[PDB]
Design a protein around this nucleic acid. Structure first.
Ligand SMILES: [Mg+2]
Ligand SMILES: [Mg+2]
Ligand SMILES: [Mg+2]
Ligand SMILES: [Mg+2]
Ligand SMILES: [Zn+2]
Lengths: 102, 150, 78, 129, 64, 206
RNA sequence: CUCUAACUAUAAAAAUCUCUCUUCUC
């Protein structure tokens, strides 16, 4: 039967969506069922900030923040653990997962 | 009285191709004596061993026999032979075997002479072998020229 | 099974004059002497090695340390 | 200036065989190419942080020899069509570059991101591992 | 080259590995105690112990 | 000195000047040092004893095992391949005469020899089986000081036994020569040999 | 009745399977 009302797409009234490739397995999935992540992280790990800091001209360097958008097929999203299979009435909740860092 | 390796020095050098005889696979790889060399045990790690991942490593070892080898690093302080099996060219293996047949066949006549005259094989090697391997690059071609040209 | 040992007599069971001379020469200059040490010097079978050990301790050539059986401790005179 | 001759690191760290290739400020002239694959055997770890770290130490040594003491480090992932993500080695490579005496300067990311080009390899259902 | 570095463990970061018998720990170098690094040590440990490190720069990762 | 008269006259050398607690009444525990500060506080030269046999509360908890007098630990680890398990008195006599032999050759009051050989024999870089199913391989790791001393002593005693097997030499002598070749950098000792082998494997699988 | 911040990286191969299903009213 209907596992979801939205079919899991989030298309619902758009005719057709262009496909965007999965970042890991190169699956072609519609941009909506193309489970998304904004991986904002430092160009240098938080582990080695000290060594880069002490050996740096331009005191207190900005240390840029690398940006990229990650597109998974849902199969990767299950396996690469970005998403987890949830219980029935827990499929309702769509909010961010309880603010990882606060 | 088997001793006195064919080559110049009393420890093998670095980054060269040799051939060992295999004796044991206990925990990490093969500690193997050398019949290309004197008597010294050298290590190969199972990572430096198998080109293809294998179920039973023994099918690629065949304990007791002779196998291709490469010495990369040599502990020239107390004696250790960093050696591998997979670190040899596909063609140069035959060069290794042919080198070994030359050296072994040279060893046989020197052993015969030593067991006849009861001079230690090292002395007969010292007087005769390496001057030949120096003048002509090998004792086998030295013997080949000696049979025809004295 | 097979003759894998290839071990010779490796020692002497009966002391000759030459080996008597040898042990009497090396009675000094040896810091530690045991039945196994006397075996190490390819001179004695081992059964008579104890005989020799008792033989050396008659004019105080070697003083003993501990007199336990199955292993003896001997150190050269000073 | 403080008599520092600026170099350019231009790190390339794919999922395999990280690259550390110091070049002059002009970028046109090359210095001390040694990569990850040169410093490890197993070929399992062409991109390993340890392979990258020896490669970076060697390039730093050659920079000492030639005389380049300050380096402009450039991180360049595979980018374009293939996964656009940094490799597992370039980070240890830059850590080694900073550690080995060299004075760092102006880290930047130059990985080429296309504007919808070149439908990439794998088919539609993609790598079916 | 004998870079044997003595690093005191100050905080053990649980136990890791598929085996479950190796522990990630925070070792700080005895000289210049302002630098800390996480590395894997195998065998029982507790804080205040001082490990030996042949190298100094292999930062650790969770072992799988 | 200090002659004390008793109806049961304990021997003179056992009554005379023993405010000097000594391992076997011969080898002075004082002025014995550990060169490598890494492994200190895991060898118990701090508490002298009069015999290498004291069965206490040593395994019930996590780290009471590390508080054993190191000579106790060597004795205890010597009774392996124990078809003769138990017979610890045999181990005590064996280690006593090993100490005597160490005192004879290269006098060097034997407790310092024991400590030095134990320090050398422990590997400081080992491996762990990481390769999961696909590419079976080992990966490098450091060794905890407790386990470092543990392996040092295990390799020392096992090398002594291997030297003993089907050999004229008494186990006392094999253990003494193992200690001698381990105190210095002598690669001839089996224990230091396997120490270097494990360290080499770790270096090969960094 | 007042708040907008960081974080990691796994997919070796695993095919097959035969019985026999037997009751509820004070
Ligand atoms: Mg269904
Ligand atoms: Mg969805
Ligand atoms: Mg195809
Ligand atoms: Mg799958
Ligand atoms: Zn995918």
């Amino acid at each position: 039967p209907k596992k979801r009302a939205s079919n899991g797409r989030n298309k619902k009234g758009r005719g057709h969506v262009k496909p965007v490739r999965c970042v890991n397995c190169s699956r072609s999935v519609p941009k909506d069922k193309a489970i998304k992540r904004m991986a904002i992280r430092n160009i240098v790990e938080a582990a080695a900030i000290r060594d880069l800091s002490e050996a740096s001209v331009y005191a207190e360097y900005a240390l840029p923040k690398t940006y990229n958008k990650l597109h998974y097929c849902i199969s990767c999203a299950i396996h690469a653990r970005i998403v987890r299979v949830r219980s029935r009435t827990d499929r309702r909740i769509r909010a961010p997962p309880q603010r990882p860092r606060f | 009285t088997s001793h006195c390796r064919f080559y110049e020095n009393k420890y093998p050098e670095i980054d060269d191709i040799v051939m060992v005889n295999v004796q044991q696979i206990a925990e990490m790889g093969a500690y193997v004596k050398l019949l290309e060399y004197d008597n010294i045990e050298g290590m190969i790690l199972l990572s430096e061993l198998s080109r293809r991942r294998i179920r039973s490593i023994q099918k690629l070892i065949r304990v007791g026999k002779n196998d291709v080898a490469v010495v990369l690093r040599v502990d020239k302080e107390k004696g250790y032979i960093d050696l591998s099996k997979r670190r040899v060219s596909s063609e140069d293996i035959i060069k290794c075997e042919e080198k070994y047949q030359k050296s072994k066949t040279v060893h046989s006549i020197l052993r015969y002479c030593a067991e006849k005259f009861q001079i230690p094989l090292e002395e007969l090697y010292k007087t005769i072998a390496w001057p030949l391997s120096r003048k002509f690059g090998h004792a086998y071609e030295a013997f080949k020229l000696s049979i025809i040209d004295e | 099974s097979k003759k894998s040992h290839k071990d010779k007599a490796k020692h002497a069971v009966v002391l000759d004059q030459d080996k008597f001379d040898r042990i009497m020469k090396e009675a000094p200059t040896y810091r530690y002497v045991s039945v196994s040490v006397l075996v190490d010097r390819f001179k004695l079978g081992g059964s008579l090695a104890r005989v020799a050990l008792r033989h050396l301790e008659n004019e105080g050539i070697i003083k003993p340390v501990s007199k336990h059986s199955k292993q003896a401790i001997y150190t050269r005179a000073t | 200036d403080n008599s520092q001759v600026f170099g350019v690191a231009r790190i390339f760290a794919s999922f395999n065989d990280t690259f550390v290739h110091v070049t002059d400020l002009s970028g046109r002239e090359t210095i001390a190419r040694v990569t990850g694959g040169m410093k490890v055997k197993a070929d399992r770890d062409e991109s390993s942080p340890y392979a990258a770290m020896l490669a970076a130490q060697d390039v730093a040594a050659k920079c000492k020899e030639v005389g380049i003491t300050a380096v402009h480090i450039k991180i360049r992932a595979t980018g374009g069509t293939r996964s656009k993500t940094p490799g597992p080695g370039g980070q240890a490579a830059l850590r080694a570059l900073a550690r080995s005496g060299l004075r760092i300067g102006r880290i930047e990311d130059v990985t080429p991101v296309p504007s919808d080009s070149t439908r990439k390899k794998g088919g539609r259902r993609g790598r079916r591992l | 080259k004998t870079p044997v570095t003595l690093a005191k463990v100050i905080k053990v970061l649980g136990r890791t590995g598929s085996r479950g018998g190796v522990t990630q720990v925070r070792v700080e170098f005895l000289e210049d105690t302002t630098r800390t690094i996480v590395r894997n040590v195998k065998g029982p440990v507790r804080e205040g112990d001082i490990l030996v490190l042949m190298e100094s720069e292999r930062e650790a990762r969770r072992l799988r | 000195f200090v002659p004390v008269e008793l109806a049961t006259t304990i021997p003179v050398e056992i009554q005379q000047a023993q405010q000097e607690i000594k391992l076997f009444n011969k080898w002075s525990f004082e002025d014995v040092e550990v060169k490598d500060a890494s492994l200190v506080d895991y060898i118990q030269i701090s508490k002298p004893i009069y015999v290498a046999h004291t069965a206490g509360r040593y395994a019930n908890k996590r780290f009471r095992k590390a508080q054993c007098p190191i000579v106790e630990r060597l004795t205890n680890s010597l009774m392996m391949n124990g078809r003769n398990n138990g017979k610890k008195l045999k181990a005590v006599r064996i280690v006593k005469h090993t100490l005597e032999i160490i005192n004879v050759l290269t006098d060097q009051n034997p407790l310092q020899v024991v400590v030095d050989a134990i320090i050398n024999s422990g590997p400081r870089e080992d491996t762990t089986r990481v390769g999961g199913g696909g590419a079976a391989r080992r990966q490098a790791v450091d060794v905890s000081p407790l386990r470092r001393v543990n392996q040092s002593i295990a390799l020392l005693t096992i090398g002594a036994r291997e030297a003993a097997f089907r050999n004229i030499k008494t186990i006392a002598e094999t253990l003494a020569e193992e200690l001698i070749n381990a105190a210095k950098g002598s690669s001839t000792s089996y224990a230091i040999k396997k120490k270097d082998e494990l360290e080499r494997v770790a270096k090969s699988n960094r």
